[PDB]
């Protein structure tokens, strides 16, 4: 038990809470323990521990952006960012729940939901043109070519020959992608990481969670995630309202969206999440 | 007509599909605030407040990026209006501190918030964006003599002058971000999931670069000196010279209330604030 292993530390961070009653999501680097109003990241390795000082900074930068919504706020002191290593990192919990695709069948909901996606993405785009933001966030080069290699190395062994051939087409298209480093890119903006309130009216975007893969990147990565989850008609509505329906943007989205399930499977592989892996490899084995 | 109907176009955009008559509105400090489930809409009463509202959004954006150990109201939208996130939780009842396990834990979380506020004193966005007025206590001393002494007994006037003299002798410190109104009501907690956890702080209307003793005095007013002593000892603020600045600011709280209520046309607060001075 990740909760049992870490019993003493949690009793200090969450005094008077039974750790058995808490929930856990798995990350690549850290395990996130989920309490009622806040989340505790626990590093899995020393290298993960050495990453948390930069995480605190990243999350503080995000907390100051104009996204039209909330983000998980670092509850540490600022000085934590100067550390070599943190043994944990506490963040505020964003309220709300995922929006199921069915709710987009109502036309006026779809419009209001798309509008709020545009505000978020517009804010991320413009923040990616800020030099202080760009200096605080990772901005790797050749991420597509290297993602392809990682899929072949880590996922192909789990696939069928037919799955390997489907994936090869999808991954080869990547090499032709311009390597764009223009926007703040969430990098895993599936519906599960986007939280809404539906208590007093039409859906209102409350916030966005799971920023582990955030970078300076190509906004087409986030728009592909949306299109993977909600399909072409809703994606087109977001592109129109945002001013992103050009053929160039739309081609990068198409290319990236064809890999989005492999992205989820690679993440599930690395964080040990078996059902998430089985789901992501549907049609490849 | 009323505020909801009058502003209904705007609220239909900001709160789509939300029946306006189901909302609650609070009278505020040059600000009408429409409360929705997860956010509030700030509308300026006065044309002066409409002019100053872009600046308030800016301050709230800066506070949203500070490391205070808790939530603050985040600007979600601006236009004239300002939409802020609502902070979850509720004030802590002074009675909760009878439990000494609760008292230590609440005290420690106050230390984090005050430390964060102190540290942010040196931040560039902070010192740029937040008001940092000079002569605060001399200007208030003149305001009191002008507006309140005419309402006071002569013995009251003696007492106030003794408290206003003490206040003049204090150094004009602009080191920390100061909430400026850090009473029990404005600090929100998560209860009934174990021991109390600080969720966030609201009502930043009077926020400035100033002297943290003001915030410590407010904590003292709300919860008493035993709880405040616990905070000062944990935070390493238990020296002589801090204790004097607190006690001196603390002594002016009824006068501050009287002066506010005297201006705002609130006769209930005025009489209560003037209690020992007439």
Numbering used by the authors:
A (entry chain B): 2 to 286
B (entry chain A): 1 to 79, 88 to 286
What's written in the study?
We then performed mutagenesis on the codons coding for the conserved catalytic residue Asp189 to generate the Cph001D189A and Cph001D189N variants. Activity assays revealed that both mutations resulted in complete loss of phosphotransferase activity supporting that Asp189 in Cph001 plays a critical role for catalysis. Degradation bands were observed on the SDS-PAGE for the wild-type Cph001 after a week of storage at 4 °C. This might be the reason why the wild-type Cph001 could not be crystallized. After multiple attempts to obtain the crystals of the wild-type Cph001, we switched to focus on the Cph001D189N variant, which is more stable than the wild-type and can be crystallized at 4 °C. Crystals of Cph001D189N were successfully obtained in a week and the diffraction data were collected at National Synchrotron Radiation Research Center (NSRRC) on beamlines 15A, 05A, or 07A. The molecular packing of Cph001D189N belongs to the orthorhombic space group P212121. Two polypeptide chains were found and built in the asymmetric unit. The final model of Cph001D189N was refined to a resolution of 2.3 Å. In every Cph001 structures, including apo and complex forms, the two polypeptide chains within the asymmetric unit adopt distinct conformations: an open form and a closed form. The two forms implicate conformational changes during enzyme catalysis. The closed form reveals that the α-helical subdomain moves closer to the N-terminal lobe domain when compared to the open form.
